[PDB]
Amino acid sequence: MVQSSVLGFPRIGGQRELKKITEAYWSGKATVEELLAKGKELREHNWKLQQKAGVDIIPSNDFSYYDQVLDLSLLFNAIPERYTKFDLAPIDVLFAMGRGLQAAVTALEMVKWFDSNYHYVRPTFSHSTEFKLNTAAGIKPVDEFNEAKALGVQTRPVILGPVSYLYLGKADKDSLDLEPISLLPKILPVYKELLQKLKEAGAEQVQIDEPVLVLDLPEAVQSKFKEAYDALVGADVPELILTTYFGDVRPNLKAIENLPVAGFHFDFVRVPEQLDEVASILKDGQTLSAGVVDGRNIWKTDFAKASAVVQKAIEKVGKDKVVVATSSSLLHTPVDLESETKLDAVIKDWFSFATQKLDEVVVIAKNVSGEDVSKQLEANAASIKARSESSITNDPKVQERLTTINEALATRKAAFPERLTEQKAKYNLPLFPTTTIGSFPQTKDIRINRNKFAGQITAEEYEAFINKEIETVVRFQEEIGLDVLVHGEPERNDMVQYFGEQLNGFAFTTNGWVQSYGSRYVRPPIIVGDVSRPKAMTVKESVYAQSITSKPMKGMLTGPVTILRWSFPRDDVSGKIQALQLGLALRDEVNDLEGAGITVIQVDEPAIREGLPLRAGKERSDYLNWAAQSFRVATSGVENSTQIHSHFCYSDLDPNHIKALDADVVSIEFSKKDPNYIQEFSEYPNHIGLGLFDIHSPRIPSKQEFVSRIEEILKVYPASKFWVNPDCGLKTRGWPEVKESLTNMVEAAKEFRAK
Ligand code: MET
Numbered sequence: 001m002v003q004s005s006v007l008g009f010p011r012i013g014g015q016r017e018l019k020k021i022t023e024a025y026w027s028g029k030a031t032v033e034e035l036l037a038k039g040k041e042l043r044e045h046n047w048k049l050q051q052k053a054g055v056d057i058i059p060s061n062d063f064s065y066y067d068q069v070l071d072l073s074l075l076f077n078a079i080p081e082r083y084t085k086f087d088l089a090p091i092d093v094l095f096a097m098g099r100g101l102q103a104a105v106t107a108l109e110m111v112k113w114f115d116s117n118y119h120y121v122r123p124t125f126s127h128s129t130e131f132k133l134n135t136a137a138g139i140k141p142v143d144e145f146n147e148a149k150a151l152g153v154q155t156r157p158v159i160l161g162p163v164s165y166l167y168l169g170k171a172d173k174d175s176l177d178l179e180p181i182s183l184l185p186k187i188l189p190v191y192k193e194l195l196q197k198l199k200e201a202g203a204e205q206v207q208i209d210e211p212v213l214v215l216d217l218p219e220a221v222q223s224k225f226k227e228a229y230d231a232l233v234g235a236d237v238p239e240l241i242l243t244t245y246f247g248d249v250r251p252n253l254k255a256i257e258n259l260p261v262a263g264f265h266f267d268f269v270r271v272p273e274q275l276d277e278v279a280s281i282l283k284d285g286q287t288l289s290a291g292v293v294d295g296r297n298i299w300k301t302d303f304a305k306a307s308a309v310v311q312k313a314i315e316k317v318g319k320d321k322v323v324v325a326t327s328s329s330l331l332h333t334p335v336d337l338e339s340e341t342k343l344d345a346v347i348k349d350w351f352s353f354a355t356q357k358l359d360e361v362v363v364i365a366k367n368v369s370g371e372d373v374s375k376q377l378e379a380n381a382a383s384i385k386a387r388s389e390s391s392i393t394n395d396p397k398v399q400e401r402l403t404t405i406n407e408a409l410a411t412r413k414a415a416f417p418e419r420l421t422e423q424k425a426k427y428n429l430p431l432f433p434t435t436t437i438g439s440f441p442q443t444k445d446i447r448i449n450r451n452k453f454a455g456q457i458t459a460e461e462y463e464a465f466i467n468k469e470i471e472t473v474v475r476f477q478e479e480i481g482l483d484v485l486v487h488g489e490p491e492r493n494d495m496v497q498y499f500g501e502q503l504n505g506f507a508f509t510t511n512g513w514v515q516s517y518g519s520r521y522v523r524p525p526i527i528v529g530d531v532s533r534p535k536a537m538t539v540k541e542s543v544y545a546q547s548i549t550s551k552p553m554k555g556m557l558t559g560p561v562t563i564l565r566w567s568f569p570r571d572d573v574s575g576k577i578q579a580l581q582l583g584l585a586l587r588d589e590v591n592d593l594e595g596a597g598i599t600v601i602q603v604d605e606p607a608i609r610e611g612l613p614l615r616a617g618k619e620r621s622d623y624l625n626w627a628a629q630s631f632r633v634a635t636s637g638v639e640n641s642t643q644i645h646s647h648f649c650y651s652d653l654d655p656n657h658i659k660a661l662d663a664d665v666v667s668i669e670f671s672k673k674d675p676n677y678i679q680e681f682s683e684y685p686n687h688i689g690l691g692l693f694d695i696h697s698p699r700i701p702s703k704q705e706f707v708s709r710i711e712e713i714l715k716v717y718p719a720s721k722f723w724v725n726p727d728c729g730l731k732t733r734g735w736p737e738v739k740e741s742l743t744n745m746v747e748a749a750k751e752f753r754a755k
């Protein structure tokens, strides 16, 4: 009998109860006792759901009030001094590290979890760090194991392992020379103690996550697995199941071929082809947990194919040594498809969210065990086939159009220098031209009226209000003398869904929420089939903004890679194909914008780095090519005098890739730290605006501040190539904050314009 296994369950709650309670606590409306009661109710509900579905191996310690990695830092005392000097109880030290503490001290760094859409709080270490078990704070993994046990639910605790935990951390400000992994001998005793305590509580297995094995690791890091696991394994601890996800472990196979662990988990959804080689290092007795139900997307699993993978594993190691698992934690998928009331039922048939993936791992397990689940198999096969044959999935018009992609469709009519000559004649922009990135402070009035349009006012009262906001922002920008204006984006809720809703090939949920960080959740669009654009998406509001000013107005688009990476993608065609269809769809929008008089156009690609393949090699370089190419397919059709802008949230984004876009103008976050980067673009003729000030702050920089910053840039970068702008948009800043800061930026550029 083959077991089923789930690596973690999302904890936000089917109605977002976790968000409600944590925010009500942070605001001082709910007591800490209320908060902890609601956590217990969620964990119980989630454990019963998995038990009820028949899952054999059910996780604990996967729950968190903010972030699981941060919960480990509390547990092991990786807690910087600054957070400890306030009388704060453990849970509020937690929240302080997580989100900062204001009283009449900044949060720890937020980082993407691999190429997922989740962020974790970076483990931060100093020379002074003393690892030890922090027990007056309760021992969360023990407490939560014990809680499930009193429910009648035996669970498998999940903890991030010692190499991954250190390796993903970073040295604190006061210890810039410290190599986190050099702390391994100090943290291993604390892991051991924790594993002893879990065994004593009755845990017989622990899932110990070492996802850094899917990354490119130095040799001196790969050797630490033997060291760490030799020290942890023994008769006084539970059996350990070393768990990897999101990629390929084979280049690191030498590091784990001789570990004393009880078993391994691999992700055969992202990398099925690694099966033969990873199965070959299993020793006699070790188990193999085959990750075959996707923890990061929402498609109903193909039971035939998934069962074949499991069956290849069984054939290599034996049926008693194989487990059917989710590929990763279901943290990355929404809680429950049954909450969806709007979706067309034919589409819904193609989906499974977290709750449904529970039933899927059970059916697959039973199937390879030899139970008769014929009816589930046939129902599953019929769903798979309905999707594969649907007209939604396959649009011939879109397929034809893909056949037209080439270098020439992705190249501007003439090269930058000739384009510059025509753009200078057309706009006559001054030296140190000033502009912004797009969004302005979101007037409570407008966001009220948004909520009101959603019947209490009709479309035109909606138009008129959107339009007055635009006017306000435009007039504002004229007043302070900015050179290239924006419209403020008041009509836009979300930079991805705003486009997705206007594109063929997308579906949307009402409740398909996934945790992004702390209590902040996203509801991604779903790409269900071939993407195309039936009609103008942005033209109306850009035309209006350009009609009320003689300054040039930027149109504003979200790029193709970002739409792809912030949506749930199709799992039946590649990322590249999706991004190219989206590039072609945006190409039609660019055409319409340009035809209507909108001849300065910005494309925003904040998720470009997020999709970077986790290892170096062919896949990574292919990605960078197709990512730049889909941007070029969107933007390359325009006239030479049309000025194309590209905006990037990442600093220290790959200069080669920036160059590969051949945008007329590039804006980048740079208000943070090292000058060699600016030097990277000095022979590159196209223009660049190194973002001068942190948007995420609220503090007004002086004029002289702005000035000293340029002269650092100009000692590396030519003034003829240089734009002046903020780091990103100002959606989240305050109006008086914004008015003084922009006025200041402009007057600085004007003084440089004069001098
Ligand atoms: C996060 S990049 C998106 C930029 C967008 N145009 C803004 O200014 O809000």
Ligand SMILES: [Zn+2]
Binding pocket: 606, 647, 648, 649, 669, 727, 728, 729
């Ligand atoms: Zn940005």
